[model samples]
Target: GAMEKSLHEKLKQDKRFSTFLSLLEAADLKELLTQPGDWTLFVPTNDAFKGMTSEEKEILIRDKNALQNIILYHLTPGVFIGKGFEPGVTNILKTTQGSKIFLKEVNDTLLVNELKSKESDIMTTNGVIHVVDKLLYPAD
Candidate 1:
């Protein structure tokens, strides 16, 4: 265990994640994730939720399986430092979902699957989290 805050603890304090955390708690996944292995969470801000339609949001909450997949898709089993990225190299990291998300360096900034991250290295007891402005949808 590291000195960093727990994943759930870190996300709980940010009001920007209130909506996301509420949905996460309602689904019973917040506590569940905290119990597991190290993971890098690519957390999306609350405004990111605006990208979904009402029907889509309902389906995400009501359909647990789909929701679980989406959540897991946001996690990886190791640390990912933005500076660790090699320029012009599309670094590959597999998510907990068994899907590969691309990390490419552009002008020294790292983009995860085309989502630009201005913030990175949010350390957690288990791992790290990099913030993205938008939510991610898993590939079908």
Candidate 2:
């Protein structure tokens, strides 16, 4: 699909995520990455998701409301990545999700709600992409 590949499709091409692509689909996030708007994503590895229950996993993808919050939880945290972005500091980042995500730059890494995020150089056709080591939740 060349540039037509969404995030779901992007991961499908990778061997490590061959086991993951379907989960993202079940999470119902395929369409979001298929659009024109730039967004951010955090596709954690299988090992990183060892702790989540089936119900919690369903809420992450099938529930659009929660999914938006989760996706937004990742985007704004590093939209400002190179602009005065410093490591080991916490920043208040606002999101399209109608709430805010708290991001901390730590040891040359990004953390959302204390979950690990990786700011990647690869840019998707629609969204500027990154892969987190874990899923993030909207902080209370």
Candidate 3:
């Protein structure tokens, strides 16, 4: 419901998104989230990174290419809110990374990439944001 703020601003004010926001900055993708767009970001919470191994964390820190691609994988090309979905509907959406994500709406709930959104339809002025509890990795 943050229609007044951009995606970057909304995430910045929430402490739970600090890790995700920092990762976006590391990947130099802050502009994509900050700028005006009709895109949607399926962002993971700080707790999402807690389950990753030390090596995974190291790779994320050292590999800029991988980090950027991973961040892009979370961004879809257009706005998709759950309220307008039909029950049992499924969609294959192309991400900004050139990869596709699977989305299914069932019983008024939305599933993206096989993970349910912890918080969905966080409407931002530039785009929409959904908080996912787990991190989603693209196939390399």
**Which candidate leads the pack in TM-score?**
3
lDDT tens per residue, model 3, 42-109: 77766676779998977975777777777774677678865465767677777877777778877667
Q: Write down the lDDT that model 2 would get.
A: 0.60
Candidate 2: clashing pairs of residues: 27-61, 88-105
Estimate, for each residue in 63-107, the C-alpha lDDT of model 2 and write its tens digit: 776765654435443334534577666776676666665667666
Residue pairs that clash (backbone atoms under 3 angstroms), model 3:
none
Clashing pairs in 1: none
| Backbone steric clashes in candidate 3, count | 0
Candidate 1 regions with alpha-carbon error over 4 angstroms:
1-3, 82-85
lDDT of each: 0.72, 0.60, 0.74
TM-score of 2: 0.63
Query: What digit string (tens of lDDT, one per residue) describes model 1 on residues 5-107?
Result: 7877777777766766876787677876577666787777655666689898788768778777776647777677654545777777778766677787677
On a 0 to 1 TM-score scale, where does candidate 3 land against the true structure? 0.84
User: Cα RMSD (Å) between model 3 and the true structure?
Assistant: 2.5
The candidate 2 region of ten consecutive residues with least summed lDDT is 71-80
- TM-score for all predictions? 0.81, 0.63, 0.84
